[PDB]
Design a protein around this nucleic acid. Structure first.
Ligand SMILES: [Mg+2]
Ligand SMILES: [Mg+2]
Ligand SMILES: [Mg+2]
Ligand SMILES: [Mg+2]
Ligand SMILES: [Mg+2]
Ligand SMILES: [Mg+2]
Ligand SMILES: [Mg+2]
Ligand SMILES: [Mg+2]
Ligand SMILES: [Mg+2]
Ligand SMILES: [Mg+2]
Ligand SMILES: [Mg+2]
Ligand SMILES: [Mg+2]
Ligand SMILES: [Mg+2]
Ligand SMILES: [Mg+2]
Ligand SMILES: [Mg+2]
Ligand SMILES: [Mg+2]
Ligand SMILES: [Mg+2]
Ligand SMILES: [Mg+2]
Ligand SMILES: [Mg+2]
Lengths: 95, 109, 324, 52, 116
RNA sequence: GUUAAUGUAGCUUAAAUUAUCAAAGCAAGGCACUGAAAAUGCCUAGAUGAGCCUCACAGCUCCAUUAACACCA
RNA sequence: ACCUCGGAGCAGAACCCAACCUCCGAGCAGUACAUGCUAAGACUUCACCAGUCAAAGCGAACCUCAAUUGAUCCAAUAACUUGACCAACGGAACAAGUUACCCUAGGGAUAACAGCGCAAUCCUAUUCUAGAGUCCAUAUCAACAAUAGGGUUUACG
RNA sequence: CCGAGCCUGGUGAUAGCUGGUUGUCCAAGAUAGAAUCUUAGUUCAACUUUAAAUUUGCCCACAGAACCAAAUCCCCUUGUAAAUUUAACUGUUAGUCCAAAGAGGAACAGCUCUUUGGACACUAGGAAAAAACCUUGUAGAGAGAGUAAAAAAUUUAACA
RNA sequence: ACCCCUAUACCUUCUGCAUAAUGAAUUAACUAGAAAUAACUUUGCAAGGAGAGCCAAAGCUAAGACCCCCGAAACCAGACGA
C-alpha cells in the first residue's frame, strides 16, 4: 500500500479491501465465500448452503487487512438499522 | 509414459480412538471403504464417515454382521458360507454418558 | 508383531479344506438364526454386551389334542383360514398355568424386585384380581402394568382373589417427593381372613395415588402376602414413607409374598384434589429440564465459522449499548 | 448432449430453477416446489441456458 | 488390528471357493462328470423324472453341475433331458445306480453316457 | 452460442392448391452380344408432432442441417 | 515428454511422505425434481482459497458413481441465474521467432576442457575343463561361467 | 570504444543479482510443507524469539485401531516442568554425510530421491591428517585427581 | 632472543574453504538502518480523554522504541558534433 501519500503524507487504504470485507468493531473481518454465485447448477444443496454464508477470517488475515485500512474503518458506527449491529461487541470471551 | 498419480493423502482414519470423550456430531473415523461399521449412537454420512450421535465414550467392538436382505450383494455372500460360519465386523459405539434430562422443581402451585 | 488369540477364534472348528462338500446356508433366515445365537454366547473379546448391559399331564393333553383334531368342522375352519379362538378361555387358562411366570418377568422388566426387595425375586402364584370401580356400571381392572388414572383410583378397589390369613399392601414405588429410596404406601390391609377383604385390619387407610404434574409415570404395586400367624404392627407424609425391604425383613419368618398387580399413574385433575383438599399443602410441579447444549471454547478469531457463531455465546438477544 | 434449461413456475410466479435434460426429448414439465407459495406447483420450461 | 489377538476375526474369503477326468488315484476312486440321458415322448414323464434323480442326488450330497436338455426330434417328439453327475464312491456306485433303475416310471430309458 | 434460410421419388431440379421430368433401377424390342435411342410402367409419409379451415399449400410445434454472426481484455 | 484431478504400489500396521518412479483412470453419464429451507458438533489433502459430513428443527413424503473440475474482476439478464482445453488447470492477455554483431548482472548452485568419484564399457590375471589342436583339456588357442586387479577408452556423476 | 554517437537532464533509473554493512558483554536460537511465468524470489504454514494469560504438557498400561516386518496411534499411573492460548514481529524456506527401510541407476558413484534417527554447520578428546564415525556437551582460575573413546590380526599344499 | 611443545591468516560465500574460491600493499581521513497504523513500556486524566476536527462498551492523550550503502547494460527529452 501507500504508507505515505504524496499530497497529504498519510496512509492510503487499499480500496480492494473495502469492497470485499466488513470489519466488526470487536476486530473480526467478515467475508463472503468465493464462488458463491459461480456454477450453482453442478453443486449439491449442502454445498450451495455453505457458500451463502458470511464467514470470519483468520488471525493473520485479520491483521493483514487491519494494516491495509486506516483508522476510519476501525471506529464505532451507530447506524440506524444495521443488521450487523449486534455483532460489533464481543460478549463472554475467556480470551 | 506413467503420468498422473500425484494425488495427496486423504487424511482418513480414526479421529477419536477408544475411550475418548466425544460430543454429538464429532466425526469419529473417516474411511474410504467400510473398514469400521457404525454401532450404537453412531451414524454414517454419504461418504461413509462415522459421526457420533450422542455425547459419550467411544468403544470399538466385534459383532456379527447380518446385512440387510435388500443388500443383494452381501446376502449372496451370506448364502455361500458353510453352515457354521459367522461373519464379524468391527463396530464403533458411543456409550452415552449423560442422561437425557432430569425432573427439576419449577414452582409450588 | 502378532499376538496369539486368547480363546478359540470363530469359524475355526468348522474350517475345512473342502468347501464344496460342506453344506451351506442357502438362505438368509438360516444364517440369521445362527447369527442371533452367536451374539448371545459370551466371547473373549469386547462386544456390545459388555458396555450396554407330569405323566398324567401329558396323557390328558395328548388325548385332548387328538379329539380337537378329530372334528371335521375344526379341520374345515382351520384349512379355510376362517377359524377363530375365543380369548376368554385362553385368558383364564393362562393365569392358572404359566401366568405366574409371565407376571414374574413383567415385574423384572418394570423394576419391581430391584425396588421392592433389592433384587430378590419371587413368583406370583396366587392370581389376584384388583379392580377399581368407576361410576356404577363398569369397573377398571388392574393387571400387571396397566394404566389407571387417579380419577379411577379415588376410592379403594374391589380386591377379589381365589385362595384360602393374608396381608395386602400398596406402595407407590417412586411417588416420594423427598427421598430417592423410600416409597409412600397407600393402604395396608393385614390379617385378611380368607377371601373377604373388608374384614381386614386397616392400619393404613386408603390414600389415592398422587403423582405430581410433569414428573413422569409412576408405578404402584399390590403386594399380596401369604401369612400364617397374625402380628400386631407399628395424612402426614412422614408417616406414609417406608421401604418395603426392611419392612418385609421384619416379617419374612412368618409371611411370604404371593401375588403381584402393579399399574401406572399419570397426573390428572384429581391430583389437584388430593394435594390441596385432603393433604393440605401446595402441590409441586416438576418439568423435564434438558442439560444445556455443548458449545466449545469461544475463540478470538473463529476462522471459517458462519456469522451466527457469535450468537451461540450471548445470552440476551436485546441490543446493549455499554457506556453510551 | 445435455441442455441446462430454466423452469419458471406457472403459479407463485417469478421463481425459476435450473435443471438438466437431453437435447432429444420434448419440453420438461415438472412438479417442483415453490418456496413462495409453499406448495408443489407445476413448472414449465421457458428458456435454455447452456448446451452442455 | 494386526498386533491384537482379534486379528483376522472378520476374514471370510477362505470360506468361499470363488473362481475333468476319471479320478481313481490310489484308493479314493471316483468318476468324472457323468451325464444321465432320459428320453421319453411325454414332456410330463421326462420333466418329472428329471426332478427325482436331482432330488435323489441332493439327498446324498452328489454334485450336480448341469441339468439341461437337448431338443426334440419330430418322429411325435422325443423329449430328452441330461442330468450331470460328478463323484461316486465304490460303495455308492452300485447303490446310486440301482435306485434310479428301481424307479423308472413307464418306458423311459436311462443313460450313463459321458461328456462331449 | 445467437439471427437467418433450408428440408423430396434411388437422387436432384421444378411446379405457387392439384404434384410435373431428367437421371436411377424393372423388364421386354432392335443387334452375334453389350452400351445408346426409343416405346412403356414405377419410384414422392411433400423432414414433421397436432388440425382453425383442407393443406408442398401455413403459422405455432419441431429434429437434423446451411450461411452470416464465434463481441469484449 | 510433461504441467489439473482421482485409484493402487513404493509408503506392510494412526496420519503424512518424493521421484522425467511403477501401473490404472477422470474432464462424464444416469435417475430424481422437497437435488426445499434451516441449524448443534466436527473433518480437512499438511497454509490460505476452497473442499467434506451432520443430529435436532421447519416443511413435505410415508441421489448413484473414486475423480467427473476453474477464483476474482460487475457487468450480459427484469430477476433467478449463466459464461473459459483461463488444460501453463491458484488462472496475466489475446504478445512469436532470432542473435556467430551481441550486451549486462551473476553462477563452479550449472555444462564443455582438466582433476576427482565410479568401473557399466574396456584391458588384464587366475579358477573351471566344454571344445578346437590326427589321437591328446592345459605346446598353443579357448565357450558358458566364476573370483580378483588396473584406471588407457566410451560413459555416468 | 557505433547492432546505433556524444553530452546534459529525467536520475539517488531499476536490479529477486554480486559486493559491502563500523562499540562492549550476556541470553534464547537449525531443515514438516503448500501455492507461485515459480523453484537464485516471495506469501502462508512449520520452526524460532519476546511479552502476557491460564492449565495442563512430555513420559505413558490395561483395553482398543480391516478386510482384500521394526514400530506407530491412543493412553491413566509414574517420573517430571513444562505446554496451550493471547499479543507483537523478524529470520530460516539453494543442506551435507552416517546407520536403517526402500525407489531410480550397474544390488556404480563423495550419485539422485523419500522416510525414521543421529551428527554437522558449536566446544573438546580420539580414528595419523580429518564438517558428518566414536567419546563428550553449559562455559572462569589451578604447576590437583579419577576417567571416557582410544594401538589390526594373519603364513598356508610330501606321500604309499 | 631462538632451539623444545602446541597451533591449517582474516573477511565474504557456502552442504562444506588452510583452501590452489572472493576481496585486501599499508597508513591517515572519509564511507552504510531514514518510517507507518497496531501492539508494548511509562506518565497524565478518566466514562470520558484531547488546546475545536478525532477516538471511546477503560478508554484517551503525550513520550520512548523497528525498517541501509555501492554497482548495470538500458530507455526517453533537449542540445552539441561531418
Ligand atoms: Mg498415490
Ligand atoms: Mg504428494
Ligand atoms: Mg487443514
Ligand atoms: Mg433430519
Ligand atoms: Mg502458470
Ligand atoms: Mg499452476
Ligand atoms: Mg558469419
Ligand atoms: Mg569431466
Ligand atoms: Mg540501486
Ligand atoms: Mg546459548
Ligand atoms: Mg529469482
Ligand atoms: Mg496423557
Ligand atoms: Mg549427495
Ligand atoms: Mg563442566
Ligand atoms: Mg577444514
Ligand atoms: Mg585466497
Ligand atoms: Mg562471489
Ligand atoms: Mg588481488
Ligand atoms: Mg570535410
Amino acid at each position: 500500500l501507500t504508507y505515505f501519500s504524496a499530497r497529504k503524507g498519510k496512509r492510503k487504504t487499499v480500496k480492494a479491501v473495502i469492497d470485499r470485507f466488513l470489519r466488526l468493531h470487536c476486530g473480526l473481518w467478515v467475508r463472503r465465500k468465493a464462488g458463491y454465485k459461480k456454477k450453482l447448477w453442478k453443486k449439491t444443496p449442502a454445498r450451495k448452503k455453505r457458500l451463502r454464508e458470511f464467514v470470519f477470517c483468520n488471525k493473520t488475515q485479520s491483521k493483514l487487512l487491519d494494516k491495509m485500512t486506516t483508522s476510519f474503518w476501525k471506529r464505532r458506527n451507530w447506524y440506524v438499522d444495521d443488521p450487523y449491529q449486534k455483532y460489533h461487541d464481543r460478549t463472554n470471551l475467556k480470551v | 509414459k506413467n503420468l498422473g498419480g500425484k494425488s495427496s493423502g486423504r487424511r482418513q482414519g480414526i479421529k477419536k480412538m477408544e475411550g475418548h470423550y466425544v460430543h454429538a456430531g464429532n466425526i469419529i473415523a473417516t474411511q474410504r471403504h467400510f473398514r469400521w461399521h457404525p454401532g450404537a449412537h453412531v451414524g454414517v454420512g454419504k461418504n461413509k464417515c462415522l459421526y457420533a450421535l450422542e455425547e459419550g465414550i467411544v468403544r470399538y467392538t466385534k459383532e456379527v454382521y447380518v446385512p440387510h436382505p435388500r443388500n443383494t450383494e452381501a446376502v449372496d455372500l451370506i448364502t455361500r458360507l458353510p453352515k457354521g460360519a459367522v461373519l464379524y465386523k468391527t463396530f464403533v459405539h458411543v456409550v452415552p454418558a449423560k442422561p437425557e434430562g432430569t425432573f427439576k422443581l419449577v414452582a409450588m402451585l | 508383531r502378532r499376538t496369539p488369540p486368547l480363546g478359540p477364534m470363530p469359524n475355526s472348528d468348522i474350517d475345512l479344506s473342502n468347501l464344496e462338500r460342506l453344506e451351506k446356508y442357502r438362505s438368509f433366515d438360516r444364517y440369521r438364526r445362527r447369527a442371533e445365537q452367536e451374539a448371545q454366547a459370551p466371547h473373549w473379546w469386547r462386544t456390545y454386551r459388555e458396555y450396554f448391559g407330569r405323566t398324567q399331564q401329558l396323557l390328558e393333553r395328548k388325548q385332548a389334542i387328538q379329539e380337537l383334531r378329530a372334528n371335521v368342522e375344526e379341520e374345515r375352519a382351520a384349512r379355510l383360514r376362517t377359524a377363530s379362538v375365543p380369548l376368554d378361555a385362553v385368558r383364564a387358562e393362562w393365569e392358572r398355568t404359566c401366568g405366574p411366570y409371565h407376571k414374574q418377568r413383567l415385574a423384572e422388566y418394570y423394576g419391581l424386585y430391584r425396588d421392592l426387595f433389592h433384587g430378590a425375586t419371587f413368583v406370583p402364584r396366587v392370581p389376584l384380581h384388583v379392580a377399581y370401580a368407576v361410576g356404577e356400571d363398569d369397573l377398571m381392572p388392574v393387571y400387571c402394568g396397566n394404566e389407571v388414572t387417579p380419577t379411577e383410583a379415588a376410592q379403594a378397589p374391589e380386591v377379589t382373589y381365589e385362595a384360602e390369613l393374608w396381608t395386602l399392601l400398596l406402595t407407590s414405588l417412586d411417588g416420594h417427593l423427598l427421598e430417592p429410596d423410600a416409597e409412600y404406601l397407600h393402604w395396608l390391609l393385614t390379617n385378611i381372613p380368607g377371601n373377604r377383604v373388608a374384614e381386614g385390619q386397616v392400619t393404613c387407610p386408603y390414600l389415592p395415588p398422587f403423582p405430581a404434574r410433569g414428573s413422569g409415570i409412576h408405578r404402584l404395586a399390590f403386594l399380596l402376602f401369604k401369612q400364617d400367624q397374625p402380628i400386631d404392627f407399628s395424612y402426614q407424609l412422614a408417616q406414609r414413607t417406608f421401604r418395603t425391604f426392611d419392612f418385609y425383613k421384619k416379617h419374612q419368618e412368618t409371611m411370604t409374598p404371593a401375588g403381584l398387580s402393579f399399574f401406572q399413574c399419570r397426573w390428572d385433575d384429581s391430583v389437584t384434589y388430593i394435594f390441596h383438599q385432603l393433604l393440605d399443602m401446595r402441590e409441586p410441579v416438576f418439568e423435564f429440564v434438558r442439560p444445556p447444549p455443548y458449545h466449545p471454547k469461544q475463540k478470538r478469531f473463529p476462522h471459517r465459522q458462519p456469522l451466527r457463531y457469535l450468537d451461540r455465546y450471548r445470552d440476551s438477544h436485546e441490543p446493549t449499548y455499554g457506556i453510551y | 448432449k445435455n441442455i441446462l434449461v430454466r423452469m419458471v413456475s406457472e403459479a407463485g410466479t417469478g421463481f425459476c430453477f435450473n435443471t438438466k435434460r437431453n437435447r432429444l426429448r420434448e419440453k420438461l414439465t415438472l412438479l417442483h416446489y415453490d418456496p413462495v407459495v409453499k406448495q408443489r406447483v407445476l413448472f414449465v420450461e421457458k428458456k435454455k441456458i447452456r448446451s452442455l | 488390528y494386526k498386533t491384537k489377538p482379534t486379528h483376522g476375526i472378520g476374514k471370510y474369503k477362505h470360506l468361499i471357493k470363488a473362481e475333468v477326468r476319471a479320478i481313481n488315484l490310489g484308493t479314493d476312486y471316483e468318476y468324472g462328470v457323468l451325464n444321465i440321458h432320459l428320453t421319453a415322448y411325454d414332456m410330463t414323464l421326462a420333466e418329472s423324472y428329471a426332478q427325482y434323480v436331482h432330488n435323489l442326488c441332493n439327498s446324498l450330497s452328489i454334485k450336480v453341475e448341469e441339468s439341461y436338455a437337448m431338443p426334440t426330434k419330430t418322429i411325435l417328439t422325443t423329449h430328452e433331458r441330461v442330468v450331470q453327475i460328478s463323484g461316486l464312491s465304490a460303495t455308492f456306485a452300485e447303490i446310486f445306480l440301482e435306485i434310479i433303475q428301481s424307479s423308472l416310471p413307464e418306458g423311459v430309458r436311462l443313460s450313463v453316457k459321458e461328456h462331449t
